[PDB]
Structures are given as C-alpha cells and as structure tokens.
From Swiss-Prot, chain A:
The CTCK domain mediates interchain disulfide bonds with another molecule of MUC2. Disulfide bonds join 8-22, 12-52, 34-46, 54-69, 67-76. Coiled coil: none annotated. The lineage of its organism: Eukaryota, Metazoa, Chordata, Craniata, Vertebrata. It comes from the Eukaryota. Glycans are attached at residue 4. Homomultimer; disulfide-linked. The N- and C-terminus mediate their assembly into higher order structures to form filaments. The CTCK domains of two polypeptides associate in the endoplasmic reticulum to generate intermolecularly disulfide-bonded dimers. These dimers progress to the Golgi apparatus, which is a more acidic environment than the endoplasmic reticulum. Under acidic conditions, the N-termini form non-covalent intermolecular interactions that juxtapose assemblies of the third VWD domain (VWD3) from different CTCK-linked dimers. (Microbial infection) Interacts in vitro with L.monocytogenes internalin proteins InlB, InlC and InlJ; for InlC binding is slightly better at pH 5.5, (the pH of the intestine) than at pH 7.4. This is Mucin-2. O-glycosylated. O-glycosylation is required for mucin assembly. Goblet cells synthesize two forms of mucin that differ in branched chain O-glycosylation and the site of production in the colon. May undergo proteolytic cleavage in the outer mucus layer of the colon, contributing to the expanded volume and loose nature of this layer which allows for bacterial colonization in contrast to the inner mucus layer which is dense and devoid of bacteria. It comes from Homo sapiens (Human). The chain holds residues 667 to 749 of 5289 of the full protein.
UniProtKB/Swiss-Prot annotation, chains B, C:
Disulfide bonds join 46-54. Homomultimer; disulfide-linked. The N- and C-terminus mediate their assembly into higher order structures to form filaments. The CTCK domains of two polypeptides associate in the endoplasmic reticulum to generate intermolecularly disulfide-bonded dimers. These dimers progress to the Golgi apparatus, which is a more acidic environment than the endoplasmic reticulum. Under acidic conditions, the N-termini form non-covalent intermolecular interactions that juxtapose assemblies of the third VWD domain (VWD3) from different CTCK-linked dimers. (Microbial infection) Interacts in vitro with L.monocytogenes internalin proteins InlB, InlC and InlJ; for InlC binding is slightly better at pH 5.5, (the pH of the intestine) than at pH 7.4. It comes from Homo sapiens. This is Mucin-2. The gene is MUC2. Colon, small intestine, colonic tumors, bronchus, cervix and gall bladder.
C-alpha cells in the first residue's frame, strides 16, 4: 500500500515509449503498488528490473531479435 | 478500388495489374495536400526464398497523421501501440 | 481547481463552497465560445430521502462536442456507448 502512487511508475511497456504518456501535472494518489524498484510485469507480481519484459507483444526475458531482451532497454 | 491480393499482386485504381515482391514498408496511398492520410503496408518474405512474399501489417496514419492504427496479421487491431476492443466508433 | 466532493459539496474555482442536493444532469463547466468542451455530472439521490444524494455519472463532451466520454460509478469508461480499454491515448 502506497501514499504516493503516480502515473509514471508503470510497467516496462511504459519504458518503451517513455516520452509519449507520462502526463505531469496531476496529484499523487493512494493505492496498491510496488516499492522503489522492481517495476511491474505484464501480469501478476512485479519482478525486478533485470527480467522485467521486452515490449508489438511484450516478450519474455529470453528472446533475441539482433536485440537480446535485457533490463528495461533493448540493445538495438 | 485499389487491391493488394496474394502476397504480391497490386491492381491500381485505373486497372493496371502488376507483380512486385518487395521487402519493406511501402506507401500504398496518401493524400497530397500536407496531411490528410497515409496508408502503409508491409510486403515481406514469408516463405523460404525472396520470391515468396506476403502482406503482414497494414498501417493507417489518419486524423492529421497523429493517430496510427495497426492491423497485424492475427487480428490484434491496436491504436497508438495499445490494444483496442472492437467495434470502435469515433467522430472521424 | 473546482471540486465536487461528498454527494453534494461544490467548491468553485474561486473558493466559495456550497451544498446543493440535486436530482438531474448538471453543467459543471463548459467553454463559452461555441464548442470547446462541456463537463456534465449526475447528482441523484442514492439513499432513502432526497437529502441523501450522490455523484453517479461524469460525462465529458470534447473534441468539438462530437466525442462523448462516460465515467460510470463502477469503472466502465465508455466512448460513444462502447467500452474502451485503458490506457487510451489519442491526439487531443
Ligand atoms: C514514496 O515515498 C517513499 C518514502 O517512504 C519512497 O519509496 C519514495 O519517496 C516514494 N515512492 C515512489 C516514488 O515510488
């Protein structure tokens, strides 16, 4: 349970855009969320940053395009 | 009516059927003014050789080119990299 | 910031808190020019008497008043009488 939940604490799919939908100017709200690290996965619990996802469909952390799926960003 | 049938058989608006076999995104139709629309389409190889091509993705850039609509080849219509539910009726 | 808290406690943009207890759709804010936007809101009785009112539906009429967005009191955001999936990012 948090007291400072904001829009831009979202999944790694939000990190794929990272400048398209953040929408600063609102107020923080209180709900269920993840701590200072371990961003939210595609479904369920929030795994740490290394094996988050690679978002197209959100692929798992074992896929190679040549872009190996990595922590947040892609080596493209 | 312009048609894109098979993997590679373009029939233009004025007759004129031809075969292409590409590998890229291609501009299929776009409005000339500054904005109006643009219809893209991926014609990439799907089989073994380069002469076995297929249509894979239709991209529509509408409403002063600020809305991108993507038609993947499994259903999966998605507006601005986000899944939508069908039907989806808007103003334009 | 204009706030609509409780069932019936309006705080205007300039201070000025007041209590109303309505039963209708009411115009909460709208642009004066000809079009710009209009924000509605239902303040209907939810309890037993007429003095037990609640907010029930927020209606937004945006993009030259051709797009209607409805915020029901169970989630259920719906654009032009059709369910949408969230997030939903557009041009305007
Ligand atoms: C919310 O506040 C806590 C302090 O306990 C800290 O995790 C951080 O400042 C905030 N969390 C965020 C922004 O995720």
């Amino acid at each position: 349970f948090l007291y400072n939940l904001t829009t831009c604490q979202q999944t790694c799919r939000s990190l794929s855009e990272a400048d398209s939908h953040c929408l600063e100017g609102f107020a923080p709200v209180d709900g269920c969320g993840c701590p200072d690290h371990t961003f939210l996965d595609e479904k369920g619990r929030c795994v740490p940053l290394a094996k988050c996802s690679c978002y197209g469909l959100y692929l798992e952390a074992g896929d190679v395009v040549r872009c190996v799926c990595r922590d947040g960003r892609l080596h493209c | 009516t312009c048609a894109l049938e098979g993997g590679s058989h373009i029939t233009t608006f004025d007759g004129k059927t031809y075969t292409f076999h590409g590998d890229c995104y291609y501009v299929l139709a776009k409005g000339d003014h500054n904005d109006s629309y643009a219809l893209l389409g991926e014609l990439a190889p799907c089989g073994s050789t380069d002469k076995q091509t297929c249509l894979k993705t239709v991209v529509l850039l509408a409403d002063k080119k600020k809305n991108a609509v993507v038609f993947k080849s499994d259903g999966s219509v998605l507006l601005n990299q986000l899944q939508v539910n069908l039907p989806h009726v808007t103003a334009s």
